[PDB]
Every structure is written in structure tokens, then in C-alpha cells.
């Protein structure tokens, strides 16, 4: 058969690449890691270096504090016994404070206090990681597309854990930290709001999640099919169109009647994905603040 280009047939290696400099502060880059032959069959073999300034240290420190806050609670539910800890791991749960306490920070540690500590730490870990995706792009003179797309994911998380609970008047409306318990919450949320299949934003969110899989299957398969004319070299195909880009366009024109460019397929891509969390966050925000029952709402509003 033809070679398919899913795995490489031969690996080739040279001196470790320290990367482009531009305006990056080099005093804050690590050394290079080891090479992985295993990873090299599918992509690059080089591990490292990594950049680590003030904002990365902060993100890591609070990220680990969030993890260890959850971890000691699980251990305490297991009665400190490591057999029980592994047996019931998927069943342990750190729960928010009860409705009684509303939005106050006055609840005891064993009954909501720890949930608030863990959420504090997660909040700083995520927002500082966001700042770092902005700054690492700026140091290299690049556009801010990665930071804007990450903001769409942050929107859904923010709505679930912070904004919707504030607007309802209590922390008890937020999501618990637990593997099985957060699935039960998701199921329960739909029941209580009259079946989320009637939320039009939920339907749209699903259209974009299915469509993201459709589109990356299309795009990935297309670039491998024209890799025999150097198609994965997308930036130079933008600057100076080659037969790879012409054949990719004509496959789709002949199949379904229209086509993209090499730059333009990447605009279709970023938008298809970002609209998943954008529409989803809106659908959750409106649930219980403005609409109590989606079935009922659907009967009155086409």
C-alpha cells in the first residue's frame, strides 16, 4: 500500500533548539529537557525549554494548593486509611456551603469553608495562567488570538462557579469538587430546570461541539492528503500559494460546491470551537435567573 503519513518512518535529530529570542527575557528560560523517541514517531521529540517568570510561579503555586486542599479533604473522608482512599476515590466530594449561609464567608471549614478556600486558589491559578498566554505572545511580537480564544472557555467556568451563584444569592448553587458528584449535579441541574434539551442555547452548543469534530476531521485529513506537496507548511502557502493549497481547495469545491483558503480555514476553525463555550455559558446564565423551566418557556416562545 501507499505510505499514509500517520507515523514517521525515519527519525532525524540535531542540536537542541533554544528557540527564537525577539523580546523574551532569556534569564527566565529553563534548560532543555531530554529527547523522547516515543513522541518522535508522531511529532517532535524535544522536551523543553520552558519559560517561568513571576506569573508562572504564582499560577503553579496556587494550582497545587487547590489540589492539596481537595486531597486532604478526601483523606479525611477516608478516615486516613489508604485502602479506603483508593477504594472510594471516585465517590468522595468537597461540597459548597448550605443555602443557610447565602453568600457569606462565615461557614465552618467542615461545612463549606474548605470549598471557599479551594475556589479562591483555583480563581488565582486560572486568571494568572490567562495573563501568561497574553504576555508570552507579546514577547514574540505575535497576535493575541490564543488569549482571546481561552477567554471563551473561562466564560463558561466563571458562569458555573461564580457569576450564576452570585446572582442567585447563594454559594450552594455552585458545583462540588468530586468525580461522580459533579456528574450527579449535571443530571440534577437539567431535571430541576425542565429538561435542558429545550434550552435553545444548549442545542446550539451541541451543534458547535459536533461541528468541531467534523471540521478537525475534514481539515486534518485534508492536510495529510496534500502532505506529499508540502501542505503542512501553512504559513508559506499563505505567502505564496502552491499546488498543495490549490488541490485542497478543488477537492472541496468539486465535492460540496464551495471552498476555503489556507489562511481562511483557520478562521472557520477558531470560531467553530470558541462558539461551543460562548453559547453554552449564555444558556446556563439564563437558567434559574430568568427562566425556571425550559419546557414551559418553549410553549410560550416558539
Amino acid at each position: 500500500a501507499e505510505y499514509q503519513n500517520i507515523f514517521s518512518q525515519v527519525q532525524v535529530r540535531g542540536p537542541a533548539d533554544l528557540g527564537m529570542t525577539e523580546d523574551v527575557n532569556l534569564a527566565n528560560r529553563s534548560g532543555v529537557g531530554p529527547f523522547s523517541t516515543l513522541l518522535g514517531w508522531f511529532g517532535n521529540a524535544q522536551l523543553g525549554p520552558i519559560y517561568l517568570g513571576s506569573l508562572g510561579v504564582l499560577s503553579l503555586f496556587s494550582g497545587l494548593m487547590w489540589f492539596f486542599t481537595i486531597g486532604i479533604w478526601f483523606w479525611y473522608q477516608a478516615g486516613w486509611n489508604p485502602a479506603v482512599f483508593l477504594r472510594d476515590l471516585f465517590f468522595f466530594s468537597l461540597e459548597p456551603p448550605a443555602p443557610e449561609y447565602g453568600l457569606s464567608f462565615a461557614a465552618p471549614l467542615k461545612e463549606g469553608g474548605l470549598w471557599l478556600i479551594a475556589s479562591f486558589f483555583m480563581f488565582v491559578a486560572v486568571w494568572s495562567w490567562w495573563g501568561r498566554t497574553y504576555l508570552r505572545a507579546q514577547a514574540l511580537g505575535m497576535g493575541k488570538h490564543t488569549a482571546w480564544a481561552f477567554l471563551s472557555a473561562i466564560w463558561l467556568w466563571m458562569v458555573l462557579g461564580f457569576i450564576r451563584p452570585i446572582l442567585m444569592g447563594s454559594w450552594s448553587e455552585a458545583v462540588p469538587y468530586g468525580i461522580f458528584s459533579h456528574l450527579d449535579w449535571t443530571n440534577n441541574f437539567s431535571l430541576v430546570h425542565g429538561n435542558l434539551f429545550y434550552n435553545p442555547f444548549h442545542g446550539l452548543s451541541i451543534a458547535f461541539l459536533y461541528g468541531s469534530a467534523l471540521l478537525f476531521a475534514m481539515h486534518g485529513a485534508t492536510i495529510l492528503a496534500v502532505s506529499r506537496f508540502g501542505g503542512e507548511r501553512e504559513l508559506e502557502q499563505i505567502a505564496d500559494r502552491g499546488t498543495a493549497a490549490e488541490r485542497a481547495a478543488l477537492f472541496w469545491r468539486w465535492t460540496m460546491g464551495f471552498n476555503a483558503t489556507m489562511e481562511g480555514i483557520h478562521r472557520w476553525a477558531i470560531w467553530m470551537a470558541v462558539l461551543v463555550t460562548l453559547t453554552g455559558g449564555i444558556g446556563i446564565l439564563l437558567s434559574g435567573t430568568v427562566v425556571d423551566n425550559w419546557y414551559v418557556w418553549g410553549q410560550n416562545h416558539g
Partner: protein
Amino acid sequence: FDLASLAIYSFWIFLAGLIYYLQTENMREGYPLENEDGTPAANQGPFPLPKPKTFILPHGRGTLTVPGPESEDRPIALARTAVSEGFPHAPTGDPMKDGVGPASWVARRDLPELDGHGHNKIKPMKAAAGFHVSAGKNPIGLPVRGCDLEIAGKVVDIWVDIPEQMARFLEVELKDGSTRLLPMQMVKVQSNRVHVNALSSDLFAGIPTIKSPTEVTLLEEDKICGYVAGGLMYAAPKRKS
């Protein structure tokens, strides 16, 4: 009526503007549409051409503005087979040599692709300090076999992408002492040989040559890759089992 209906109706209007923006951005190459004779077609569709943008290319290589004037900048050896629109156009000579159909190339610039530091992106491994085969079967030294099961030559180097650390071509020596490049995506490395399905042994000499022995240009890569992919259709007579 209520705030949720205000939101869903606003969202549908947003989405229509977004599709409009996305379709026009995807019209920066290839338009305006043409008739079979190269004149402008009458019906271009409901979307207009976008206003031009300009890319600044690195390393003093200038600018690109699109959309802009489109032309093939090369002869096309084809003729009509019917008296109306929509039928195939037949090659008038040899389609492998003329560069049409699945053997087609484009007139890209006749300079090599450069890296982040302004050096040639692809080099023969002999001129690429510290580079070596780290895993898999090393092809250098192996005979090369065509789809007619006959030996066309032997491998004498690998051409590597330095920034991305990847094998991109095999350099093959022919019966007369000259060499050609073969794309890595169109060969099969085995224990005792390299196999090439797309070409028969007699078609190897017609692979386009490069003008300098230590670099390849974008125009040269297109001619080479176009020609080897073309043998899947046009060599098929000699391919076998």
C-alpha cells in the same frame, strides 16, 4: 417579550454577519470566477470581493497584497473535448512533461524557504552539522525500486528540515551518476530496499533537476512533487501487483 427571546434573536443576527465575514475572507485567492476561456464569468455569486490586506514578508522579501491580479504565468497544454461548458480538457502532448492534471505545478518563487534566522530551511544532511538518524532504518546506501519491480538507483543522502527536525526528501543517484530528489511522503522504506509505487524505473530520469546541489527552491519543490504524484495516473500501464 422576555430577555431570553431577546438573546436568541440577537444571536441569530450575529451568526449571519459572522458567516458573511468568513465567506468573504475565503475569497482572497482564486476570484473573480472565470469562463473556460479565461474571461470573467457573468455570475460571481451574492458575496462581493473583500477589501485588500497586505502581508509584510520577513528577511527583506517584500509584501503580498490579496486579492490582486491573478495569472498562471505559464503555458497550459490542454484542449477542449466538447462544444459546451463542463467537460474535461485533454492533454495535447505528454502530461508528465507538460505539467497538467495530477502532474500540475504552480509558479511559486524561485527562492528557497527560509527559517526564523534567515538561513535555508532544507539542507542535505552532509552539510547540516550535528544531524543524524536517531531511530528507524537509515536509508542511505539502499537500492531504489520502481513500480515495475526494476532498480532505478541508490540513496546517497537525506534532505532535512533543520527548524522542525524532519526528513523531507531522499537524494537518489541514477545509472548515469546524476541525482534527483524524491519526497519522503511517496516512498516506502524496507529492510533491504526503498520502494516507489508512483513511478516505473524508466520515468526516474524525467524528474526535474535542481539548479544548485545544496539547496532547493519553492518552484523546484512544486515541479518535483507534482511530477511524482502524476505517475499514479500516468505511469499505471507499467505498475504491477
